[PDB]
Structure 1
Amino acid sequence: DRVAQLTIGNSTITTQEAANIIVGYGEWPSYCSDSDATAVDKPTRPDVSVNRFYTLDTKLWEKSSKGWYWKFPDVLTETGVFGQNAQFHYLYRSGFCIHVQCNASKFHQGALLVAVLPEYVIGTVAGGTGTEDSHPPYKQTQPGADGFELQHPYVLDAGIPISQLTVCPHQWINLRTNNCATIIVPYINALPFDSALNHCNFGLLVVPISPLDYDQGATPVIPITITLAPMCSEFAGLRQAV
């Protein structure tokens, strides 16, 4: 009966679920009272047009799914008006409301770990048994709004144990208990501003830890819908032509 609307795009949502909303590192996104000069040409703080409800193409969860990840702000870097701002500016800064939702029956099974890992550097295989340093292409490091699938979920495709991914801001999606998860992300960098197209401040991981299951006859693929909204987006830079 509840319809949450912010902007031009509207979304129907159940919240706040099993564990309420997760605010990353106990810190809400803020504008920047501090940075940096501060000069006359200083940040351009838009909303609510740019800072709206963006809903990515739905992903299909399968018995054999290994997991997906998205890079921020790379996902929206080509999407609508935010994509426009991020491209034709020099400096960028923002927070994010990330909302992940499943649609499944009470006869479906499984558990997703939804997490946010700042500076998510990818490492690919150097040969199954060997040492060849090849580094991931753009299609894998910055997979755009369509995201990318994990090759080795156990090591998060970076030699790092997924069993400890919960040190990062996270929320569980257990189809038995809840169908949705919400994570709030503040701007995290060693600089107040950075490049939107060259630096991905964090990655969003969605990994099945307990595999999807069902008896045969039920819908064999479960949709994972992702809605995300930038919160205190700030664009310095100025003019640009790509």
Structure 2
Amino acid sequence: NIVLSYGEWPGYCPPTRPDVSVNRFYTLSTKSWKTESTGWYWKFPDVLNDTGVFGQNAQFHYLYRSGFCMHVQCNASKFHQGALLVVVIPEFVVAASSPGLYPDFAHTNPGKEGQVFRDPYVLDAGIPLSQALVFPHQWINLRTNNCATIIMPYVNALPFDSALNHSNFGLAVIPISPLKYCNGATTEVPITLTIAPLNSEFSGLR
């Protein structure tokens, strides 16, 4: 069920505090999990920077502070098999790879669509995927569960920061065990990410 990141609920700062126009569920474009899929990551709050009332607040306020509640729903039949690791990585700095030593803006801030991994083994950051379980995470085993819920509080060296310039954390959905099925099953499995900001605070209104 629900997992609390670092065992702390998100809370208010002891500034704009929207009640229900921001606290609503945001449902992102569904990702097609296929056999050859490497994985996807989103940057927060970059994923919601241009999406609904939260998008309007994050673009017209100097400072920002919010927790998040992520639901990763998966629509698969009992005849589909595979395991996703859903990991939240605080300060997920994406690395470039060169035989281009600096990643493009499209990779650092993929937006609401999200970016695919190129080297999910090293998480595109030079750190092993095998040790990614030190970060707050949930398994989605298609034979056990098709849901992951991670509650992430605000983590920063500063009490407030810019939504547009800084991403507090990244959320990665990575197929560890590849999706596999038999001829006749749907060739893809939908993966739905639902985000709900919790305890959102804003400053510098214009």
Q: TM-score, normalised by structure 1?
A: 0.84
Amino acid at match of 1:180: C
Match of 2:136 among 165, 169, 177: 169
Q: Distance in 1 between matches of 2:44 and 2:19?
A: 19
Cα deviation per residue 1:166-222 (whole Å; 9 max; x = unaligned)?
A: 100001000000010000000000000000000000000100000000011110100
Larger Rg: 1
What is the alpha-carbon root mean square deviation over aligned residues? 0.7
Structure 1 stretches of at least 4 aligned residues deviating more than 6 Å after TM superposition? none
> Is residue 135 of structure 1 aligned with residue 102 of structure 2?
yes
1:31-70 matched pairs, under 5 angstroms: 31-33=12-14, 43-70=15-42
Structure 1 unaligned spans of 5+: 1-19, 34-42, 128-132
Match of 1:115 among 78, 83, 87: 87
- Between 1 and 2, higher relative CO (CA 8 Å, sep ≥ 6) is seen in 2
> Is residue 205 of structure 1 aligned with residue 172 of structure 2?
yes
Q: TM-score, normalised by structure 2?
A: 0.99
Match of 2:46 among 74, 93, 112: 74
The SS at the match of 1:145 is: coil
The SS at the match of 1:159 is: coil
Q: Distance in 1 between matches of 2:112 and 2:150?
A: 18
Give aligned-pair identity as a percent. 72
Between Structure 1 and Structure 2, the one with more strand by share is 2
Q: Distance in 2 between matches of 1:104 and 1:68?
A: 18
Q: Distance in 1 between matches of 2:49 and 2:122?
A: 27
Q: Distance in 2 between matches of 1:83 and 1:23?
A: 25
Q: Distance in 1 between matches of 2:133 and 2:203?
A: 33
The SS at the match of 1:236 is: strand
Match of 1:150 among 113, 117, 122: 117
Who is 1:21 aligned against?
Answer: 2
Aligned residues: 206
Structure 2 unaligned spans of 5+: none
